[PDB]
Amino acid sequence: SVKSEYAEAAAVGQEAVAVFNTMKAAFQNGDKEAVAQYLARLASLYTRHEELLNRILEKARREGNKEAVTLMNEFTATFQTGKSIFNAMVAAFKNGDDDSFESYLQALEKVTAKGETLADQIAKAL
């Protein structure tokens, strides 16, 4: 069901949380090579999370599950913020700008954290 599909999406999001915090440890240790690889992994995970989220929202719409559609619109809006800041983070890494990278790393955390009470609400609506 859409619910199992959201569980699969939730797991992929958690995988990105795991890799992100392991990437944040590398960065603070100055292990740039590991960071470069982790950032490639994270993008691949976020891109796959986005795809499971879009399919879930489209399916909620085809089902007419108005509340789930509302919440998923709100979720996908927060999700595009993460994308924007994530792409700037990667750009700061490319540029060698550690000050901007640190800042973007903190932003994503508050973007991910804030967007979590919604994520649990979607589970319960689908």
Ligand X SMILES: OCc1cc(-c2ccccc2)on1
Which residues contribute to the site for ligand X (CB under 6 A)?
43, 46-47, 50, 79, 82-83, 86, 108, 111-112
Distant-in-sequence, close-in-space partners of 90: CB < 8 Å, separation ≥ 6: 39, 43
Rounded to a whole number of angstroms, the minimum distance from the CB of residue 1 to ligand X is 24
Rounded to a whole number of angstroms, the minimum distance from the CB of residue 32 to ligand X is 20
Contact 90, 43 (CB under 8 A): yes
Q: Residue 54: exposed, middle, or buried by beta-carbon count in 10 A (0-12, 13-18, 19+)?
A: middle
Comparing CB distances to ligand X, the nearer of 27 and 86 is: 86
Comparing CB distances to ligand X, the nearer of 62 and 86 is: 86
Comparing CB distances to ligand X, the nearer of 60 and 85 is: 85
Rounded to a whole number of angstroms, the minimum distance from the CB of residue 114 to ligand X is 9
Count the alpha carbons within 13 Å of 120 in the hemisphere toward its beta carbon.
Answer: 5
